[PDB]
């Protein structure tokens, strides 16, 4: 009678207003249990770290409502007045942040995240049953640079295009560029991907280049795995080489989840006594595929995220940060071999190095588990083998997480003890029931037992408290 | 003493803590300029709406810092306990929204968006080249159905697939499911689609059913536009007929930007030969397409919200909001038959309705530009007798956005008015022109050019005052 | 160097130049027994023929054993100064045959047979996964034009292509352009064929023209069974409205077995005022396909064939030989369609005609098993709607082959009634038993056991007495 | 019909059986002036040949005129009764003529040519897109075991197909198979092929056969080379380690244009502890893909003449043949190598040889043209090393032609000096010309020069009168 359905109107509208902690305590919960568990523990997976405040706090802004399908150009849509000065902003800082003329690069900034990104660019590019290289899955590439095998085919990229991949010689851990370049011939490639997700060495984007314009195709980077280190300018840029490159925001870029694909323009080839000229229409193929091509509409709220990162990105404190992420690289590495273990290519180049078990019977699936118990999380990644996938022989740290809480040589080589001593675990339940019986099993006397949660129990507690002593950015602890 | 470095990293430290409104101003005043442009003005976009505070509260949460590759039960990456809970929940709430026994169907809430749950299904049950038919585009289907021309394949639907589309009758506006039978025998789709963007009336799942089977296809419903209207059960629901049900979390369902893939399991075919059964492998393949197939590490903070929205969807002043939503529906469609406009289909079943303006000289196209320099958004729509694309006859109102916001049948009365207004601006100053006058042109007189933008000035006040009088859900203030 | 360069070498040497009738008793017997059934027999086989001396006379000659691979242009063997002859002769008796000015058209006289030469042009036109329209198999249609299944795709052309057909209406026998305009707008052929196996009406090249170039395809003209009767003159030619014929050299047109692809070249169409030209490059790619993209070695032998074949084509004996196949045509389905049989689309057009056996309770699998027994040669081919084959309720009779021989309409009738008896036989043989007998339940009692294989064995008689009263075209008794 | 037309009836009843000599004195003509040619020339080219009189009397036979659709027990026409003779008769003397046991091997002898059969094969095991691997085209390889450039796919196999070459030794000049072996594992063949078309050395099937194996893949031999020289015992038989072995007719078997396909059958499976048994399935597969799959009708008179040639590869005659062909291959390659020429990879164990004229300054493209001149059937090709390609380096040499002729040791080694006259005489009339080369100028020379064509002109009478001596296989005269 208070005007009709008075009551209910009066929630819903408050409903829509309410707080989380009150509308779903439920959910409210679990983000605080994750919260806290990334708090207190090491976090050594490559491909993790912590956003900053700034950043997270524009993915939750009402630009989450806006539907702006097309393109700074033309939208279908009206009222893009500001998701366009966004946009604009965006694809300006994305060329600044690795000093890009304008003249001859341009940006997409609507990939909803890293494969959606290298897809869309394979789309544009290569299109149906078109050939791919890249390097191996098992070798240190990525699934979306083309990954089947024998059997199956696992990837998108290796169903909706023809891909062969080029390897790492096993003696060394290094590419093989000089078979690269052999097979290259025979396979006619119609674009070369230059990227990787385990590998601790540059590329030899030079020399790939040449390969590239040999068979004349397009040599692709996927810097996902380095975006922040070459923005910061502590490593080799690709953007002297390719003709495209691609990446997520996330990782050592330090931003919210997305992915960007940055393409040459222009300025193409010239001819010598032909003298004609030749150029690019990578801008057009590529923001084609991308929309209607794949996309719906763009996220607008994440690409307000990589805009915050991205202006972060260029900052001193950037810069500086990730040094120290490169140096302790080194410094875990130097301890962890120091200790004994075996370190693939000897060390690194960058903010990741792999380990191989093998040479003291245990494999990266036991290892790996044996360590998340202890608050230690990682990679059971691929070593250069033929084994497989869940079940593998060699671990992947990477730093820059823990760098930016902080960690410093000293804690990293602290950090590389624990390690020393959940590896030191493994081994020994390895033997207190040495049979014949797989990872399944494994979780046994590590999940029940109790006198063998008892050693856990202890470096668990160590590791907790030694983690707790570091801040984490975010907000308010949430 | 130690100045010289550790002076840095106590920027560094504030930089990752430090509020947007400090890090970053510039992007600051565009997210708050955006939520003022939400505020006054009159939303009339069908596929937009405003998520609740408790949702966007999730989506700046410490989830978007976690890698968990794989699924629950076996992740690719340790640390995924509570991830796990969280995506958990979130396919239990999915399938409770929806009253689906959890016997005979599955989730997956890993989609990025609604494009992408698509091109996931069709990568998993039709294969590369396979046949699919879809709602032509111009006939209310969506581009992700299908969508090629005489020379171009645009959506990466018909590029990797073979599509062909089925039409609706131009003479009343409804689906000719007559022709589709027909054709359906004759092309051998693999898989049929029911759903639109652009559709005022509901589906006739029963008998798309029949014909689906009638050539062993797939029925697979894309109910995006009215995932909120079927889950509250103001409208018929697509699952009682259809193999696969995929949708976008945000529109109807007021979440945020995701999608979701509804699937069949059990058993199929009782095979009344002998007693021998027959299941679902639909799981199987989805689930693999979705990853590692198609995507990479999932947004574990978007999930986190469509939780959220998937509780508030529950509720009952979810399903008394969502009468309203259709409640308003008529009364603009009424009040705007009632003032002389033609209605395709003569009204609406759902939350939208499409304008045939043709029957006033003017198109979609300019009437679309003068509604929004007068803060209504609209979005112009192809339609039946002839498509010029961009370049319409008619318009696509919906109701979610306002009904939202409060707005009741009354106060949709004065904006079909307001509605009225400026298609009677439009008429008006097309005729003081050139009668070969391009469409840029048209946008130019009514640029800052003319005594007209007074007119509109007048008008858009008069919106914005009416609008600036309701509420607007959200965060209160950053 | 002992019983070799004497004996061994001895018989070499004659094993070389002895005949057939020596060399082979066994090959040379089966050759005579079948020369034999061919001349003792009536061959109402729509699509055979006996070819004249002069052509067989040149199929053995030297030209068997030369290797061209390539073209009067340039080939990649030596020696072809004649062959080169042979081939430019050939082809220029081509365009003479079919009035053709060889400013506006070109052959291609290499393709192995009918089959191949299509195979040849979709290669050359539509490319990988392009779209194909031809007509239903059991519609009229030839597998080459494409034929699949909701289960397989059949035929080469729907596998490496991708094809939908058009029908008849069951209901008169006709093409229903009508339909084909409409799908033709939803699945945007790249290729339409206007050609069948079992259709005895003229097409209407003039309509499939006009919605060949609406939905901007090719428009193909497959005239095999009525090669002749074009080039004679006695049928309108598809030359006039489509771009591209392809043929087989048997059946209407007496030849030797083999194929030829003829292209339109030469200003495809002029910009309405800019002077620029769009031409025809049909030439370019067709030649191409055939080699080095799809055959070896054109086989000279068959090429000196055809061009025999392709001279007598344009006598007035030729003109006259296939006037009185028109006519007995109709002589044929008069006298039995007087004796009360079904004839599809009510009579003849050309030199065929389609029984429909169905009001008769008898399907053409069983009659044509009978009348084979009595030294009369059919088709049982399907029917417009025959609710699935295995049951086809029709006969498809031919008359280029006896007339050939000399027939006349008088002898014709006599024809039409030793049929007339068959049938009836049929009846007979099946209205005992005249259950759910499957054909192969027929298929034996009928020959099989009951004795009265002494009724076919009356027919049979009187059939051979009738046939060997005829003259039989060819080799002097080979 | 009255005395009107009936006259020319008389005429066209002649026409029919009259003789090629006075039907078509053109063609007539050309065919003799054909036969002399071959008569007074050597022939050198590799895969020619001279058809025995009996095989050559049964293409032109009544067969020619038959339609037999289908397979022996299960046609889509009658009549076949003896047509089913005759092409089981062929299948039987098939698997004699290459001792395989019938409980194992089975064949198909309707393919038109040597490119259909393979063609079919791969349609039949690999389908669209699947991956194939052959000899690289200037290594060896046949244009139809794929061949494309970076720029675009050339034969049809590389372009329904996904293919890739492996290659030889350029510094030997034999078959790589450690890297054939090595690239199996990155790109997954579904089928490798062990066929040439210009290697002198025997193939290791042993060892294909083991990485076709390890990949799991399908090893097909293309012995169109050498199937006479298999059949007749003198070399290798890869029926010991192929599943498929495809062939044409001609060329080293003495026989008429056509191929056949033959195929493994019958088991090949039990493994796990019970006794599988899942035999093959390759009768099926490819039985269908060459019909209804590729072809039309068979080509009857071919298959006879075919059965013809079968017969006659089983003699003594013949196998003594052949042996005498590989000698006089020896003699050539030595009185070749004594005159101080480059042979490829020394000598030869079959039929043909490789010149390397590079070692002259002269290239195989000039001095194919010079030795053409002198009746010389000669013939340019690429060999291992040589960028060339373009500029060949090479002349392929053959045997079985002239063997067939009766020539023996001492008049093959007259014939190495005839050839020897030849290069010389193009190093000549190349001595003296520019520098920058340009074969265009070189053939322009080679014609007008007086002294050059009298140099010609007294050599190729030498050598006319020199081949004239010998005997010539074929029918009397024609
Ligand atoms: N009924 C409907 N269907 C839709 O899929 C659609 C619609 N409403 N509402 C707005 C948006 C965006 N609509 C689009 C419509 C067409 C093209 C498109 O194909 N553009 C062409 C232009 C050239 C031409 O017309 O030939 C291109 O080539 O890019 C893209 C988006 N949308 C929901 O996604
Ligand atoms: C024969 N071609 C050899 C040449 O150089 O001429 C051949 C064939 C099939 O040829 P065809 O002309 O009958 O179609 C197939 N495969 C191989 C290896 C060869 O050598
Ligand atoms: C000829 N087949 C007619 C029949 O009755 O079977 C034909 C062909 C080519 O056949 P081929 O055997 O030489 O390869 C191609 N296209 C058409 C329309 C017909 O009729
Ligand atoms: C039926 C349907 N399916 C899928 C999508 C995919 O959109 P997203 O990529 O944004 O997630 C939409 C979007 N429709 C938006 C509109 O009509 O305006 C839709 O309407
Ligand atoms: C080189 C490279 N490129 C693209 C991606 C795309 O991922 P996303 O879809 O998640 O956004 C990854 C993922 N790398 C993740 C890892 O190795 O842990 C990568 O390593």
Request: glycine share 8%; net charge neutral.
């Given at each position: ?7 209910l ?21 679990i ?8 708090r207190?523990?090491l976090?050594l ?5 912590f956003?900053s ?12 409502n806006?539907?702006?399908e ?9 009222g893009?007045?500001?998701?366009d ?8 800082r ?22 959606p990104?290298?897809?869309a660019?394979?789309?544009?590019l ?26 199956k085919?696992i ?64 040599l692709?980077?996927?810097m ?21 490159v ?15 694909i940055?393409?040459?323009?222009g ?22 595929a ?9 996220h607008?709220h ?41 370190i ?7 903010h ?8 003291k ?8 588990k ?15 083998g033929?084994?497989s996938?869940?079940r ?46 797989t990872?399944?099993?494994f ?5 029940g037992?109790?006198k ?21 950015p ?5």
């Amino acid at each position: 009678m208070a005007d009709r359905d008075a009551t209910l109107w009066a929630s819903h509208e408050k409903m829509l207003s309410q707080p989380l902690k009150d509308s779903d305590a439920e959910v409210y919960s679990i983000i605080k249990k994750e919260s806290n568990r990334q708090r207190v523990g090491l976090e050594l997976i490559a491909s993790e770290n912590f956003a900053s405040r700034a950043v997270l706090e524009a993915l939750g802004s009402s630009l989450n409502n806006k539907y702006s399908e097309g393109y700074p150009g033309q939208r279908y849509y009206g009222g893009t007045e500001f998701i366009d000065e966004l946009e604009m902003l965006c694809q300006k800082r994305a060329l600044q942040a690795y000093h890009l003329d304008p003249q001859c690069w341009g940006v997409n900034v609507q990939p909803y995240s890293g494969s959606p990104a290298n897809f869309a660019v394979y789309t544009a590019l290569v299109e149906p049953h078109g050939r791919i290289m890249g390097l191996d899955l098992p070798d240190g590439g990525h699934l979306t640079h083309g990954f089947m095998t024998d059997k199956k085919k696992i990837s998108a990229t290796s169903i909706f295009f023809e891909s062969m991949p080029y390897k790492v010689y096993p003696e060394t851990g290094y590419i093989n560029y000089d078979q690269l370049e052999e097979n290259a011939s025979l396979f006619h490639p119609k674009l070369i991907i230059a990227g990787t997700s385990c590998y601790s060495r540059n590329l030899d984007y030079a020399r790939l280049r040449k390969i590239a314009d040999d068979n004349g195709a397009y040599l692709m980077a996927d810097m996902a795995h380095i975006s922040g280190l070459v923005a910061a300018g502590v490593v080799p840029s690709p953007f002297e080489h390719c003709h495209v490159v691609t990446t997520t925001t996330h990782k050592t870029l330090r931003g919210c989840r997305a992915g960007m694909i940055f393409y040459r323009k222009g300025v193409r080839s010239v001819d010598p006594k032909t003298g004609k000229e030749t150029y690019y229409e990578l801008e057009s193929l590529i923001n084609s595929a991308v929309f209607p091509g794949l996309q719906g509409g763009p996220h607008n709220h994440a690409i307000a995220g990589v805009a915050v990162a991205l202006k972060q990105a260029m900052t001193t404190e950037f810069k500086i940060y990730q040094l120290q992420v490169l140096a302790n690289c080194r410094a875990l590495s130097d301890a962890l071999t120091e200790l004994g273990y075996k370190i693939v290519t000897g060390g690194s180049d960058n903010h990741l190095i792999l380990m191989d078990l093998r040479s003291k019977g245990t494999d990266g699936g036991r290892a790996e588990k044996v360590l998340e118990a202890c608050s230690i999380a990682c990679n059971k990644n691929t070593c250069p083998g033929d084994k497989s996938a869940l079940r593998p022989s060699g671990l992947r740290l990477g730093t820059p997480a823990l760098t930016s809480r902080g960690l410093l040589e000293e804690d990293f080589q602290k950090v590389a003890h624990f390690i020393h001593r959940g590896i030191e675990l493994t081994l020994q339940i390895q033997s207190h029931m040495a049979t014949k019986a797989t990872l399944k099993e494994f979780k046994e006397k590590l999940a029940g037992d109790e006198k063998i949660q008892s050693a856990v129990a202890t470096l668990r507690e160590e590791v907790e408290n030694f983690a707790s002593n570091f801040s984490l950015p975010g907000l308010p602890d949430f």
